[PDB]
């Protein structure tokens, strides 16, 4: 499923991402935008045997298991396929866990490059949520 910006904003708010560990809603919306363009089925193969899955492109080397990645750590203890669902529940739970490490949202390079230290509220500014 390809979310509408505001549609996803409301979804992420519903799933408690706004102000989660000091990160306003916009941060997550921005990251979703640059990572997958709000597409839950987005996937990306990497040079190692890993793959990034979902609306937030979570890597199978450390966060999820796809039964076909060498040196998998499966920190989110979740099948990577769960991160491709139209229901963002799984991707959100894993995201919340990733950001709970010492480096927070800095885990997402795209967030640092195009969201970190910017007026992220712009992303939700305009939605009636």
């Amino acid at each position, epitope marked *: 499923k390809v979310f509408g910006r505001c549609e996803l904003a409301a979804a992420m*708010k*519903r*799933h*408690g*991402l*706004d*102000n*989660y*560990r*000091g990160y306003s809603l916009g941060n997550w919306v921005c990251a979703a935008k640059f990572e997958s363009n709000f597409n839950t089925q987005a996937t990306n193969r990497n040079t190692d045997g890993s793959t990034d899955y979902g609306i937030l492109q979570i890597n199978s080397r*450390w966060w999820c298991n796809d039964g076909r990645t060498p040196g998998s*750590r*499966n*920190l989110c*203890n979740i099948p990577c396929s769960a991160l491709l669902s139209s229901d963002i*529940t799984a991707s959100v*739970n894993c995201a*919340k*866990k990733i950001v*709970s*490490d*010492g*480096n927070g949202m800095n885990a997402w390079v795209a967030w640092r490059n195009r969201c970190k230290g910017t007026d992220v509220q712009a992303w939700i500014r305009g939605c009636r949520l």
Partner: antibody, heavy 113, light 109 residues
């Protein structure tokens, strides 16, 4: 199936250091974030802090000064160190996964002279 | 300021077969970042509901959670004999994580 077990001195004297060990079996200590939670008398729970998969940590502010959480990857265990204890540190200590899906049996540590 | 979770009633006596609702209130909005735990005497805490209403595979279906923001509720559809003990809520929205004072589910006679 991942399992946890707390071990360490059951008695610590005032002003000394409290040390506890959590042994991770079934999986690697590097496969999750792990925490230390204590229960004071009167059913009062306190989330002392946690250590990530990377080794970084977060400590409860009320403890940020006396607490330190470390891990040993070759042994699959992580530890809790709490300095300058007083009788108020007497409690049941538990180690658990960050997700709260796994918990040790917990171990009582009493601070007394 | 650390988030304070207030649970009520502190204690609740019911007859097995009856249904009950347990309240947990947060001093600040925490969206859906509220988790429910059960702890029976001499046993370690067990996670029942995560993120306000998400079910945990392996937990009896009589247990369910609802609420959002600052008001949460743990519901037990027809309490069973092995369900008595302590119930605590915990927020993970902000560090430090904090627990509510707990509600004691006891047997009515």
């Amino acid at each position: 199936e991942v399992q946890l077990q707390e071990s360490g001195p059951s008695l610590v004297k005032p002003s000394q250091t409290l040390s506890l060990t959590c042994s991770v079996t079934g999986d690697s200590v590097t496969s999750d974030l792990w925490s230390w939670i204590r229960k004071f008398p009167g059913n009062k729970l306190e989330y002392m802090g946690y250590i990530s998969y990377s080794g970084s940590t977060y400590y409860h502010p009320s403890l940020k000064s006396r607490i330190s959480i470390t891990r040993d990857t070759s042994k699959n265990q992580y530890y809790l160190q709490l300095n300058s204890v007083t009788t108020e540190d007497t409690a049941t200590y538990y180690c658990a996964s960050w997700g709260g899906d796994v918990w040790g049996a917990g171990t009582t540590v009493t601070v007394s002279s | 300021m650390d988030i304070v979770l207030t649970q009520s009633p502190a204690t609740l006596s019911v007859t097995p077969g009856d249904s009950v609702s347990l309240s947990c209130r947060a001093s600040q909005s925490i969206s859906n970042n509220l988790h429910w735990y059960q702890q029976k005497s001499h046993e370690s805490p067990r996670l029942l509901i995560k993120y306000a209403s998400q079910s945990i595979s392996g937990i009896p279906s009589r247990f369910s959670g609802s609420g959002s923001g600052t008001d949460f509720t743990l519901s037990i559809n027809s309490v069973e004999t092995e369900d008595f003990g302590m119930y605590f809520c915990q927020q993970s929205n902000s560090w430090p994580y904090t627990f509510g004072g707990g509600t004691k589910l006891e047997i009515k006679r």
